[PDB]
Structure 1
Amino acid sequence: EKFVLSLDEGTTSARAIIFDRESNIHGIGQYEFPQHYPRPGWVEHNPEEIWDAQLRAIKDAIQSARIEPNQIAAIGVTNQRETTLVWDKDGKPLYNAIVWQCRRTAEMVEEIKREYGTMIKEKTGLVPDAYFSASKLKWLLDNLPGLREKAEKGEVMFGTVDTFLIYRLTGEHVTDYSNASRTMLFNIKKLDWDDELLELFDIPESVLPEVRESSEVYGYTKKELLGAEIPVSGDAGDQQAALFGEAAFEAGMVKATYGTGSFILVNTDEMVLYSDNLLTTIAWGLNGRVSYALEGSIFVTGAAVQWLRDGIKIIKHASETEELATKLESNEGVYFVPAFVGLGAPYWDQFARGIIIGITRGTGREHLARATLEAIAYLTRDVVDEMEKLVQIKELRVDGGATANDFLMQFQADILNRKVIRPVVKETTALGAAYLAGLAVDYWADTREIAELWKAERIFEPKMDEKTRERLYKGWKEAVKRAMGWAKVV
């Protein structure tokens, strides 16, 4: 009878899903939109194609579900983070979106890093880098003819993609704590735009949205858009939303997203924890309570499997990796550190390059496939062990297409000595935004009810003894050391 609609506005695709209270999908839609690459290292989206893709996703999902718009109890919104937009009082872009992947501001933030880096890290949980919204917003109103003067009294709204979508759906100009936290203009311990950061990036207050909790009615949709006046009541950044959708509701519950690269986040609850090797960020603001997180990422995980397929071409499909790797009882001394663009935490070596080591006459395709799957697990452990210094790790909940690889998921549990939990619902980003929106209109009673209803497809239990974990991991660290500094030699 009644359902929650989730919008997951991802970086290459917009998705829409209709869920019931048992997290069954009744309809879904998904449309790709163009990735604009105007100069080298530059990444842009056209907000009108994001919008058209999203709105068609919605229509497909409603059609597939065979519901009327008035059966939609609420809408949650979740989104590619950091990506920075600007628009008219009428909701019309004053420029393309500058995507989180875009490096145009690399040197702008390089300069301020020596002077203001540690202050930026304390206020925000973030290491200054072009990734985040501040430099990008500044770039727009310093290079866009007219923008700064249009901003200088109040004709310009800034937003992250959530904020752009919410404005277009409801008329309101809002963001949630988790999206806000990724702007590098938001003070995370106070829960407010930081005035010093605004002055550093020459940002006029008038463009800023109002910052709200992640679960709350922000506004209602116009009838002429969706056919009903639906409350829009859920907002979080995508990775935070996936962490919610995984029901990672307690401190120490980790969620790892496996893709081209990886994004890993751990719930720290009310603790605001700081690491030299991790981002500190906001998970969500729920019923007056802010939950925090620690975040680590890896550029190359699944891409190492794409390299097996496209570079040396020893497989036709990523999935063949599993059959090859399970022909072996161990790695037989063969490791692969796929440091195609360096090493990140905890080694931080831009000059490291990929290495395969332990090759003998008997080394086969099997060894390379297994070394590649092991490497994804080892890199994951590298991040999780940094988190573990600050918060006890309970378990790993996982999403992304590579989580269908049973070998990788088992080895991941084994090497962490932690359970790995794979959800029945694969679209955890969407499901999280659905949970946040639904809680705000009592579609679910509270988070304990959500957690009681939540269903695992499969639980991978750790089966590897300490001696074995520590010998395998030791191999990994030794291989990593042999990858370091290679591009200085060459």
Structure 2
Amino acid sequence: MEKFVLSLDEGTTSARAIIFDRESNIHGIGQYEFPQHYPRPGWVEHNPEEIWDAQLRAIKDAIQSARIEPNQIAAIGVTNQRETTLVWDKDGKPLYNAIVWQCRRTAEMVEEIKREYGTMIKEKTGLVPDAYFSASKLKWLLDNVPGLREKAEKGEVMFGTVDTFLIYRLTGEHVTDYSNASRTMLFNIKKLDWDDELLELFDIPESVLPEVRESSEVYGYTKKELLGAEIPVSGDAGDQQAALFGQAAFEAGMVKATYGTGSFILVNTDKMVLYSDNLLTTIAWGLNGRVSYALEGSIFVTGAAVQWLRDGIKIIKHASETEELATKLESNEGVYFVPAFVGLGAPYWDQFARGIIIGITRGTGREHLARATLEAIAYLTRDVVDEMEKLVQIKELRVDGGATANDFLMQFQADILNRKVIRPVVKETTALGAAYLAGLAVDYWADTREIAELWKAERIFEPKMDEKTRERLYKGWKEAVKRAMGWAKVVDSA
């Protein structure tokens, strides 16, 4: 009887489940949104019970839609939004909301630390000190949740990133993989272990920490009842590395970009550890006793600028609408939108940037905003790829996320880059990457030589814009960006 891999993609706004076959075809999808909690300006929280309930409901639909029995699921892969920090008790009940990777409550605290400790943290961690990472968020939780520092000091608090939470709830194990752990700013990526000086700096009791494992490994087994069969949980990577793995990006020098709420661009650097003042050195995955590294640019707001057109000012009914508006014009006509809704990530790392639409005139319409938002998404990607090029060659880009279906966005992307932008036949690249990691671990697949042969270019966009136009459109953007900078640090009237 035919078996399949189940994969959880617990994203920032939606918890999803995709059942895959050994050719990497999809057989079932469940997806459910759960609420975003904005308790204060620039504070973002998710409720961990709503995550789970959405994540469960999603598994059942994928199963149902695929019409397999539970017994036909060989392995569960887990993947997740990365920096969102949870804490829960032995019976597994949250001691607060998750502080999301998007949340900035720690910005002033990290700004001070960065000054005196920036280089030390970067050398241990690969990371640029920022509110984005777990470390400062655990600290804030420990100092602000009434009686959790004391409970954690009693060895009664479990910390995790989202993969950890989901694996706990599924198997009762307290673990994370190297990739999600590289993201906490507490984990030493050269030594591959929790870092003592860092636990001190942030005042972290160690009892709180999960055990760090590889990215492909049986971590545990599901109660038969949750799902009806007892299934191995065997794959675990942060979502943006799982999309790297989902893209078959298995050799050093291979680059993907995923477009969602934000956009994240990873080059696989393999056994090599590469340094960049303005990008992230991160772990890709741990597989077969070996560790792959990666270089990342993390761009916090890309598709969220399209959500904002639909939901904030409501100039559109759907994201789909953005493309036909945009293509109503033959250029941006001097209109630019730097959507720095809360600061800029890579490579500017300005916690104070805010968003700006500049170049407005009497004729600025819905079409110019649609276009400026789409092009922003392409400029932000280049800001990162150009910084990667200060040290390493970036040939071409493999891409994924809903936005990749927008052909205007995709052609504008290859055009301002002067690089091929390639979308594959599989869509759920993030899900498929956690599936491959799990499948590998119970022999559902034999090796990555095998898996590599499963990957296919659906379409390849080729650059066809000339230098003068590239350079002039990008020079507008660069100038637009300067104007977004520092804004939350002159104003508040906020």
TM over 0.5: yes
Structure 1: segments with no counterpart, 5+ residues: none
CA shift in 2, pair 1:283/1:107, >3 Å? same
The answer to which of 287-296 and 433-442 deviates more is 287-296
Counterpart in the other structure of 2:120: 119
CA shift in 2, pair 1:369/1:220, >3 Å? closer
SS at match of 1:196: helix
> 1:142: Cα distance to partner?
3.0
> 1:410: Cα distance to partner?
1.0
CA deviation digits over 1:250-273, x for unaligned, max 9? Answer: 223222222343222222222211
The answer to which of 326-335 and 43-52 deviates more is 326-335
> Hey, what's the Cα distance between the residues in 2 that align with 1:354 and 1:165?
34
> Hey, what's the Cα distance between the residues in 1 that align with 2:163 and 2:288?
20
> Hey, what's the Cα distance between the residues in 2 that align with 1:9 and 1:304?
21
> Hey, what's the Cα distance between the residues in 2 that align with 1:467 and 1:481?
21
CA deviation digits over 1:173-219, x for unaligned, max 9? Answer: 21100011111110011100011111122222222111111011111
The answer to which of 266-275 and 91-100 deviates more is 91-100
Contact preservation (8 Å) 2:106, 2:137: yes
> 1:327: Cα distance to partner?
4.3
> Hey, what's the Cα distance between the residues in 2 that align with 1:340 and 1:167?
33
CA deviation digits over 1:86-110, x for unaligned, max 9? Answer: 2233323233323222333333333
CA deviation digits over 1:428-451, x for unaligned, max 9? Answer: 211110011011112112112112
CA shift in 2, pair 1:85/1:278, >3 Å? same
SS at match of 2:453: helix
CA shift in 2, pair 1:132/1:67, >3 Å? same
> 1:453: Cα distance to partner?
1.0
> Hey, what's the Cα distance between the residues in 2 that align with 1:446 and 1:249?
11
SS at match of 1:453: coil
CA shift in 2, pair 1:156/1:379, >3 Å? closer
Counterpart in the other structure of 2:307: 306
CA shift in 2, pair 1:345/1:227, >3 Å? closer
Contact preservation (8 Å) 1:241, 1:429: yes
CA shift in 2, pair 1:303/1:139, >3 Å? closer
CA shift in 2, pair 1:142/1:28, >3 Å? same
> 1:364: Cα distance to partner?
6.3
> Hey, what's the Cα distance between the residues in 2 that align with 1:177 and 1:484?
34
SS at match of 1:483: coil
SS at match of 1:257: strand
Contact preservation (8 Å) 1:268, 1:294: yes
Contact preservation (8 Å) 2:102, 2:300: no
CA shift in 2, pair 1:488/1:192, >3 Å? closer
> 1:354: Cα distance to partner?
5.4
> Hey, what's the Cα distance between the residues in 2 that align with 1:178 and 1:348?
21
Contact preservation (8 Å) 1:174, 1:212: yes
> Hey, what's the Cα distance between the residues in 2 that align with 1:230 and 1:310?
40
Contact preservation (8 Å) 1:29, 1:57: yes
CA shift in 2, pair 1:272/1:370, >3 Å? same
> Hey, what's the Cα distance between the residues in 1 that align with 2:360 and 2:200?
56
CA shift in 2, pair 1:148/1:315, >3 Å? closer
> Hey, what's the Cα distance between the residues in 2 that align with 1:156 and 1:61?
33
CA shift in 2, pair 1:479/1:175, >3 Å? closer
SS at match of 2:356: strand
Contact preservation (8 Å) 1:62, 1:69: yes
CA shift in 2, pair 1:306/1:88, >3 Å? closer
> 1:355: Cα distance to partner?
5.6
CA deviation digits over 1:138-190, x for unaligned, max 9? Answer: 23333334433333342222211111111222222211000111111100111
CA shift in 2, pair 1:329/1:178, >3 Å? same
> 1:382: Cα distance to partner?
1.0
The answer to which of 178-187 and 327-336 deviates more is 327-336
Contact preservation (8 Å) 2:86, 2:97: yes
> Hey, what's the Cα distance between the residues in 2 that align with 1:223 and 1:347?
48
Contact preservation (8 Å) 1:19, 1:26: yes
SS at match of 1:422: strand
Counterpart in the other structure of 2:444: 443
The answer to which of 480-489 and 457-466 deviates more is 480-489
CA shift in 2, pair 1:94/1:344, >3 Å? closer
1:425-464 superposed matches below 5 A: 425-464=426-465
> Hey, what's the Cα distance between the residues in 2 that align with 1:373 and 1:189?
38
Contact preservation (8 Å) 2:279, 2:347: no
> 1:456: Cα distance to partner?
2.7
CA shift in 2, pair 1:160/1:312, >3 Å? closer
Contact preservation (8 Å) 1:251, 1:391: no
> Hey, what's the Cα distance between the residues in 2 that align with 1:208 and 1:110?
25
Contact preservation (8 Å) 1:341, 1:353: yes
1:274-313 superposed matches below 5 A: 274-306=275-307
CA deviation digits over 1:385-412, x for unaligned, max 9? Answer: 1012222112212222221110110121
> Hey, what's the Cα distance between the residues in 2 that align with 1:93 and 1:153?
17
> 1:343: Cα distance to partner?
5.2
Q: Percent identity?
A: 99
Counterpart in the other structure of 1:222: 223
> Hey, what's the Cα distance between the residues in 2 that align with 1:348 and 1:83?
19
Contact preservation (8 Å) 1:259, 1:402: yes
Contact preservation (8 Å) 2:14, 2:34: yes
Contact preservation (8 Å) 1:252, 1:395: no
> 1:313: Cα distance to partner?
6.2
> 1:348: Cα distance to partner?
5.4
> Hey, what's the Cα distance between the residues in 2 that align with 1:403 and 1:331?
20
CA deviation digits over 1:45-87, x for unaligned, max 9? Answer: 3322222221221122112111111111111111111212222
Counterpart in the other structure of 2:246: 245
The answer to which of 433-442 and 445-454 deviates more is 445-454
> 1:309: Cα distance to partner?
5.1
> Hey, what's the Cα distance between the residues in 2 that align with 1:272 and 1:150?
37
> 1:116: Cα distance to partner?
1.9
CA shift in 2, pair 1:471/1:40, >3 Å? closer
CA deviation digits over 1:322-367, x for unaligned, max 9? Answer: 2344344445555554455565544556666656666778776655
> Hey, what's the Cα distance between the residues in 2 that align with 1:63 and 1:457?
28
> Hey, what's the Cα distance between the residues in 1 that align with 2:147 and 2:473?
59
Contact preservation (8 Å) 1:268, 1:391: no
The answer to which of 324-333 and 405-414 deviates more is 324-333
Contact preservation (8 Å) 2:127, 2:185: yes
CA shift in 2, pair 1:487/1:137, >3 Å? closer
CA shift in 2, pair 1:363/1:351, >3 Å? same
Contact preservation (8 Å) 2:42, 2:342: no
Contact preservation (8 Å) 1:82, 1:131: yes
CA shift in 2, pair 1:270/1:52, >3 Å? same
> Hey, what's the Cα distance between the residues in 2 that align with 1:351 and 1:103?
10
> 1:42: Cα distance to partner?
3.2
The answer to which of 378-387 and 127-136 deviates more is 127-136
> Hey, what's the Cα distance between the residues in 2 that align with 1:37 and 1:486?
21
SS at match of 2:309: helix
The alignment covers a number of residue pairs equal to 490
